[PDB]
């Protein structure tokens, strides 16, 4: 058997930031739509729409774009609600960006993040999406089976 969800978590509010120059806005949107669908049919509560549309940004601006987008999205929520997930599209070879982004999200914004490399975003394979959904589920407090 493959791993599956036991308890699906909840992602009611999420956003996407893209850092790859090969990824146009509608590809980021489509990728996130398909990932959201996979998360839902696997057993999560997962909003099919993000709080804000995807934004594309330069890696060098990572701190500022994360903080600005976090603030803008959070401000759009009903009072007291918080962002559950940031989906980040990253260049395949991104140097210090991955580590910088995880530090900022974990220790400054306090938001769960799921990174997805450009090469996988183009393909949107079922198996890839299923694995990412499993990872998101654990990060937001869900529980998966073990092999």
UniProtKB/Swiss-Prot annotation:
Q: Where in the cell is it found?
A: Cytoplasm
Expressed, tissue-wise, as follows: Widely expressed at low levels.
What is the top-level taxon of the source organism? Eukaryota
KO phenotype (gene knockout): Narrow rosette leaves. Single shoot bearing a terminal inflorescence. Abnormal inflorescence with infertile flowers and filamentous organs.
| Oligomer and partners | Interacts with turnip yellows virus (TuYV) protein P0 (via F-box-like domain); this interaction targets AGO1 for degradation, and thereby suppresses its function in silencing. Interacts with turnip crinkle virus (TCV) capsid protein P38 (via GW motifs); these interactions inhibit RNA silencing ability of AGO1. Interacts (via PAZ domain) with cucumber mosaic virus (CMV) protein 2b; these interactions inhibit AGO1 function in RNA silencing. Interacts with SDE3. Interacts with HESO1. Interacts with URT1. Interacts with RICE1 and RICE2 that act as cofactors.
Q: Which family does it belong to?
A: Belongs to the argonaute family. Ago subfamily.
Q: What does this protein do?
A: Involved in RNA-mediated post-transcriptional gene silencing (PTGS). Main component of the RNA-induced silencing complex (RISC) that binds to a short guide RNA such as microRNA (miRNA) or small interfering RNA (siRNA). RISC uses the mature miRNA or siRNA as a guide for slicer-directed cleavage of homologous mRNAs to repress gene expression. Requires DRB1 for directional loading of the small RNA duplex (guide stand and passenger strand) onto RISC for passenger strand degradation.
State what protein this is by name. Answer: Protein argonaute 1
* Shown residues within the full chain: 593 to 738 of 1048
């Amino acid at each position: 058997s493959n791993k599956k969800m036991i308890n699906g978590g909840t992602v009611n509010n999420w956003i996407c930031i893209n850092f790859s120059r090969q990824v146009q806005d509608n590809l980021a949107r489509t990728f996130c739509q398909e990932l959201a669908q996979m998360c839902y049919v696997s057993g999560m509560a997962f909003n099919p729409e993000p709080v804000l549309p995807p934004v594309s940004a330069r890696p060098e601006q990572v701190e500022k774009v994360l903080k600005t987008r976090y603030h803008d999205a959070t401000s759009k929520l009903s009072q007291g609600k918080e962002i559950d997930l940031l989906i980040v599209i990253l260049p395949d070879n991104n140097g210090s960006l991955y580590g910088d982004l995880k530090r900022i999200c974990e220790t400054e914004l306090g938001i769960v993040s799921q990174c997805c490399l450009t090469k996988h975003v183009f393909k949107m394979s079922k198996q890839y999406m299923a694995n990412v959904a499993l990872k998101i589920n654990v990060k937001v407090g869900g529980r998966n089976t073990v092999l």
